Short mmCIF file of C-alpha atoms in Angstrom, two decimals:
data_model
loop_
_atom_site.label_atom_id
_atom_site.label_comp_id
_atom_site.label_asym_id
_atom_site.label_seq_id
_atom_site.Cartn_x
_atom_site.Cartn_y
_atom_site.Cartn_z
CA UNK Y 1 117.61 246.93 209.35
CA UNK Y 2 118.10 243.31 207.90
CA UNK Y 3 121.02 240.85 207.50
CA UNK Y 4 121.60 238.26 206.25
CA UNK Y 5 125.04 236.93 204.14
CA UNK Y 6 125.76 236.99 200.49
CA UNK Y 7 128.98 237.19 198.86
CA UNK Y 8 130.13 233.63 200.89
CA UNK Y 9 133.95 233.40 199.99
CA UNK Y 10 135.21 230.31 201.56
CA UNK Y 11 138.62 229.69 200.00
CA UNK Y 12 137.50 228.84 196.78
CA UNK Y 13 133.58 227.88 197.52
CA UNK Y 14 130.97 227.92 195.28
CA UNK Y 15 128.34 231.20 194.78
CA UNK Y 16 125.41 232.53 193.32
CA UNK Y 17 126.81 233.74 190.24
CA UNK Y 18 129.32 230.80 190.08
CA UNK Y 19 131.52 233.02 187.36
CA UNK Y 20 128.57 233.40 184.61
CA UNK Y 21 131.31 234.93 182.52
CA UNK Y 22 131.54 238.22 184.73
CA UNK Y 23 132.94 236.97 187.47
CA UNK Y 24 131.58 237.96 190.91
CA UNK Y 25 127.84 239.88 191.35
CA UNK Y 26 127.55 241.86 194.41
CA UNK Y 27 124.36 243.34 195.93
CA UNK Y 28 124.99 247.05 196.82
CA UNK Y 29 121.53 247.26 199.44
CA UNK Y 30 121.37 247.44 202.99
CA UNK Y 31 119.79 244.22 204.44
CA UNK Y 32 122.96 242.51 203.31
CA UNK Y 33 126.52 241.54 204.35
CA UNK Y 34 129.51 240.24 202.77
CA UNK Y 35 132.83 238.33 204.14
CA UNK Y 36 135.54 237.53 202.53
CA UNK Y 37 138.02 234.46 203.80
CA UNK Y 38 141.01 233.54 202.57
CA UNK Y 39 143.63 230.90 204.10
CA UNK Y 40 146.67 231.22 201.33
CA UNK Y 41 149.13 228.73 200.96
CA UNK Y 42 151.77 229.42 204.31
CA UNK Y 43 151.56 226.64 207.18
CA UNK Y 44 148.71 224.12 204.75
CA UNK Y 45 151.43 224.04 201.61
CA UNK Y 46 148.41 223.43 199.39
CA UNK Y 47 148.05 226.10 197.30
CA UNK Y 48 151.56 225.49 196.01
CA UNK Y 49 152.52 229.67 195.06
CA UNK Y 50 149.12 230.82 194.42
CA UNK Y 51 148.22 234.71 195.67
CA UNK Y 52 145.85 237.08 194.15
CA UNK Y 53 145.27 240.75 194.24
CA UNK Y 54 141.62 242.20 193.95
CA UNK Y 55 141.64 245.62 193.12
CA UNK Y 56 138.68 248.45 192.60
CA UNK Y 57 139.50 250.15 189.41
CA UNK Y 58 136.91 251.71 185.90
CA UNK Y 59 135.60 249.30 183.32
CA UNK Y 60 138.47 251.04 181.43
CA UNK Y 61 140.76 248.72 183.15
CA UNK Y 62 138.28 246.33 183.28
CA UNK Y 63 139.09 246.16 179.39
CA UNK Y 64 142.90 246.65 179.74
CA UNK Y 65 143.33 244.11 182.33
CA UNK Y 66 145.28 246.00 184.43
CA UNK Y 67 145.11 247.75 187.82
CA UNK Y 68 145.82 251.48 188.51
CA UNK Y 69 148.89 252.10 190.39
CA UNK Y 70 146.65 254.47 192.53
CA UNK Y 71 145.69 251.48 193.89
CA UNK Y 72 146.27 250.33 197.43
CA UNK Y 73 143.46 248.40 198.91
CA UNK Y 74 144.44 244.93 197.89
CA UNK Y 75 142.26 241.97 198.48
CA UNK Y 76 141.35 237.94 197.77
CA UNK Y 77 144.85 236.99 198.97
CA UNK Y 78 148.12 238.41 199.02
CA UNK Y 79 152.22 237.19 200.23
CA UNK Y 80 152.86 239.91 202.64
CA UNK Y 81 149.28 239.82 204.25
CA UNK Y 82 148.58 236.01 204.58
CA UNK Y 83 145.17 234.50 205.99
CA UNK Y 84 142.70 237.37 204.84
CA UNK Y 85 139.69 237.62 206.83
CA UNK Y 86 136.96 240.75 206.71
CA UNK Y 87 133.57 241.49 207.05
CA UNK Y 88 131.60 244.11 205.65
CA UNK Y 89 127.87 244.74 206.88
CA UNK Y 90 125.60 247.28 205.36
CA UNK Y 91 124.67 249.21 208.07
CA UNK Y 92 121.85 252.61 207.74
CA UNK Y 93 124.82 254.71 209.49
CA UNK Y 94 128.47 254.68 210.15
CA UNK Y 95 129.97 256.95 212.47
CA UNK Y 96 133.29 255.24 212.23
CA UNK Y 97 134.36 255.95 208.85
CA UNK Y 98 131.58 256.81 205.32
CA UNK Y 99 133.36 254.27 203.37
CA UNK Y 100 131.28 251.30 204.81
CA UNK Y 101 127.84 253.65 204.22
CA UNK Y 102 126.84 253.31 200.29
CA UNK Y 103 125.78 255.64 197.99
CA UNK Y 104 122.57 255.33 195.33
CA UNK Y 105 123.10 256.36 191.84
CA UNK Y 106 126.37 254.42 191.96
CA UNK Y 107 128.53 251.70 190.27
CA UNK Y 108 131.31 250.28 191.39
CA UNK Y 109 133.55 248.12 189.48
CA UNK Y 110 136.88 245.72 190.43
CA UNK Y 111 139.13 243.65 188.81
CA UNK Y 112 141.78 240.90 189.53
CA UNK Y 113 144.95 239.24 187.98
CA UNK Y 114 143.95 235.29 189.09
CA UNK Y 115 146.22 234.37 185.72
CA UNK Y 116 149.36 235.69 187.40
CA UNK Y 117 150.92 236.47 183.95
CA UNK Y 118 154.93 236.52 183.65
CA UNK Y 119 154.08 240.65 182.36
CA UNK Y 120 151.67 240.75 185.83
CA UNK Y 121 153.64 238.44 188.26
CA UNK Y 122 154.26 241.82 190.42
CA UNK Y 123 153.45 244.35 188.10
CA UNK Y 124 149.56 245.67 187.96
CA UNK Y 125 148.78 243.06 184.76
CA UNK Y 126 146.89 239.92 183.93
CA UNK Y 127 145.23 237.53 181.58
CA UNK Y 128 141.58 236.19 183.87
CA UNK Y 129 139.59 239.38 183.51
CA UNK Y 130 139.97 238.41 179.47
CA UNK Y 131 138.72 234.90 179.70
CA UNK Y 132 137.70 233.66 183.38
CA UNK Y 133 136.37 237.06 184.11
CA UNK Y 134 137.49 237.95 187.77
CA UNK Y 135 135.85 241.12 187.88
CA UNK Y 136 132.89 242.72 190.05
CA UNK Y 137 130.04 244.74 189.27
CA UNK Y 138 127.44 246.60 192.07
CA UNK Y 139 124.40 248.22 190.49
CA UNK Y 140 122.23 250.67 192.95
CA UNK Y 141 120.20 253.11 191.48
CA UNK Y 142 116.31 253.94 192.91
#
């Protein structure tokens, strides 16, 4: 039962991967833990209308660069949420709820719309997932 902290969103820090052309690579093993901070532009005025949307979606909209509408857990920071703050920890067991235990054979992929397109403003669209890459990939097999 280890833990230590990858993952280290700090605004708009620096990371391991530092987008390679990806984006964002997590580590889907348990030893690890992951927290996301975000302070938004609200009291600070410094991001000057900036908010983003992460959103888990296929490599399918990976390549469209759009979300699904299915969608609903919305992340990296949105208007009607402000500051963004959580933690994940991969834990052995989770009596609380299965969706913070992880699953082997797996992949898990997510996407985001950092361009903020005129066609994406509010709709599910963007432009970043075709050129910064703002998408994430988790590989766990064995």
């Amino acid at each position: 039962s280890k833990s230590i902290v990858l993952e280290p969103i700090y605004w708009n820090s620096s990371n391991s991967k530092f987008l390679p052309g990806q984006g964002l690579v997590l580590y889907p093993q348990i030893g690890d833990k992951l927290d996301i901070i975000c302070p938004k532009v609200d009291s600070k005025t410094v991001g000057q209308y900036e908010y983003y949307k992460v959103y888990m979606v296929d490599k399918d909209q990976a390549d469209r660069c759009t979300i699904k509408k299915e969608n609903t857990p919305l992340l990296n920071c949105a208007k009607p949420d402000q500051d963004i703050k959580f933690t994940i920890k991969f834990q052995e067991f989770s009596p609380n709820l299965w969706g913070l235990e992880f699953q082997k054979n797996k992949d898990y992929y997510i996407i985001s719309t950092s361009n903020g397109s005129l066609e994406g403003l509010d709709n599910q669209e963007g432009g970043v997932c075709q050129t910064r890459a703002m998408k994430i990939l988790m590989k766990v097999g064995q």
